[PDB]
Amino acid sequence: KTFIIGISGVTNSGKTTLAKNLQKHLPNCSVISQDDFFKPESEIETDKNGFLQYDVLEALNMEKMMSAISCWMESARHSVVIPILIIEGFLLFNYKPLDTIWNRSYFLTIPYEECKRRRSTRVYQPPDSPGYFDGHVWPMYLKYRQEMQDITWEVVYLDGTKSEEDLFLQVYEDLIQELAKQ
Ligand SMILES: NC(=O)c1ccc[n+]([C@@H]2O[C@H](COP(=O)(O)O)[C@@H](O)[C@H]2O)c1
């Protein structure tokens, strides 16, 4: 009845833009962004070096996100008199409760050098502290990729250095084939 797409990947790799571009070309499609479920700074912990622990599941209210997904599911049942949900976020594929929800999974990748450069041009709240990328972001990303070594479902890895349109066309082409097989 429904088709759920997961778009994860390294930080600042065009995940939200890809989700939005796909949505504009798919009927009855909604998007849920993991970034909307981060806990407030006051609830974030710090490591031995004083770095805020934002790049781990503990920094997110995943129970609240599951509730949001369940709400979409209920809405989807009344949207037709196929409903598509795209869930996008940097830490989705290591969350066990959702391991069986994915009908198709995409993962945006960008090498260390370029990822660091792009991250610096972006402003977060709170802003990245000095040395935050090498001290927390990248190490946690590597931990995430390590956890994914034992992933239990198929993931399509994407080159995040490709253009917005290139990525959209690539994923759309794949998605329509998957929808057809359903
Ligand atoms: N959303 C917030 O309120 C918030 C606050 C501080 C740091 N961050 C950063 O956002 C990143 C993930 O979001 P993106 O995948 O969009 O870059 C994480 O790597 C994290 O370090 C987000």
Question: Solving technique for this entry?
Answer: X-ray
In short, whether 137's Cβ falls inside 6 Å of ligand 1 is yes
User: What are the beta bridge partners of residue 38?
Assistant: 60
Q: Which two tokens stand for residue 35?
A: 């970034």
Structure-token match 């909604």, residue found = 30
Instruction: Count the alpha carbons within 13 Å of 169 in the hemisphere toward its beta carbon.
Output: 5
Strands 29-33 vs 84-88: parallel, antiparallel or unpaired:
parallel
Asked whether the beta carbons of 138 and 116 are under 8 A apart, the reply is yes
Structure-token match 């190490």, residue found = 139
Q: Looking at this protein, which amino acid is placed at residue 32?
A: I
Q: Looking at this protein, which amino acid is placed at residue 110?
A: I
Spacing, Cα 34 to ligand 1 middle (Å): 9
Distance from C-alpha of 144 to C-alpha of 69, rounded to nearest angstrom: 22
Termini Cα distance of the chain:
9
Strands 84-88 vs 3-9: parallel, antiparallel or unpaired:
parallel
In short, whether 90's Cβ falls inside 6 Å of ligand 1 is yes
Kindly report the number of other CB atoms within 10 A of residue 62's CB atom.
17
Go through the domains of the chain in sequence order and give each one's CATH number.
1-182 (3.40.50.300)
3-state secondary structure 51-83: CECCCCHHHECHHHHHHHHHHHHHHHHHCCCCC
Pocket test for ligand 1, best of 90, 119, 144 (most atoms within 8 A of CB): 90
Structure-token match 């990822």, residue found = 115
Kindly report the number of other CB atoms within 10 A of residue 182's CB atom.
10
| Residue 104 marked ligand-binding | no
Strand, coil or helix: 18: helix
